[PDB]
Design a protein around this ligand. Structure first.
Ligand SMILES: Cn1cc(C(=O)Nc2ccc(O)cc2)cn1
Length: 165
């Protein structure tokens, strides 16, 4: 199972880890992708997860978009986890670099409550432009299921743990 995680709360755990390497190791039931509404997995966590699937995630995602249209900011969809997980929960956190409503981050984290356990990144963090300290706070105050957060950046991981209230 998950190893080397620091327990933050009853249900939230955190580790300084590459979520792709963590997914290949754990092979969780659910890996969360930091998706955009178009499921265009170009960069950040999405680009890394997609590259690990040899682009199979993008091929599946394009078929999903062709059939269903784009997701909502704050929404999600369950697709295959390919070689990384049983499922991938593609969750769209607001991208503050695209001027999206930061208040939608709580709605984005609510998607995690539909799954008993997840391996996830901090939503809207990284190239999505939100403050990761704020994202972790929304995560702990919203998610009730067991969430194992992988934070790629060591310096950010240390800042998140040392400032966690
Ligand atoms: C590697 N990495 C660093 C960050 C970061 O520091 N983001 C950030 C954005 C807005 C803020 O108000 C404060 C911090 C995200 N990923």
């Amino acid at each position: 199972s998950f190893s080397g995680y620091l327990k933050l709360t009853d249900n939230v755990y955190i580790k300084n880890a590459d979520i792709v390497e963590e997914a290949k190791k754990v092979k969780p039931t659910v890996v969360v992708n930091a998706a955009n509404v178009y499921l265009k997995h170009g960069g950040g966590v999405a680009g890394a997860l997609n590259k690990a699937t040899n682009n199979a995630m993008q091929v599946e995602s394009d078929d999903y978009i062709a059939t269903n249209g784009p997701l909502k900011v704050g929404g999600s969809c369950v697709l295959s986890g390919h070689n990384l997980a049983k499922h991938c929960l593609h969750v769209v956190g607001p991208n503050v670099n695209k001027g999206e409503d930061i208040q939608l981050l709580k709605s984005a984290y609510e998607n995690f409550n539909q799954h008993e356990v997840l391996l996830a990144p901090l939503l809207s963090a990284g190239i999505f432009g939100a403050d990761p300290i704020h994202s972790l706070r929304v995560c702990v105050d919203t998610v009730r299921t067991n969430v194992y957060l992988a934070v790629f950046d060591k310096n950010l991981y240390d800042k998140l743990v040392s400032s966690f209230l």
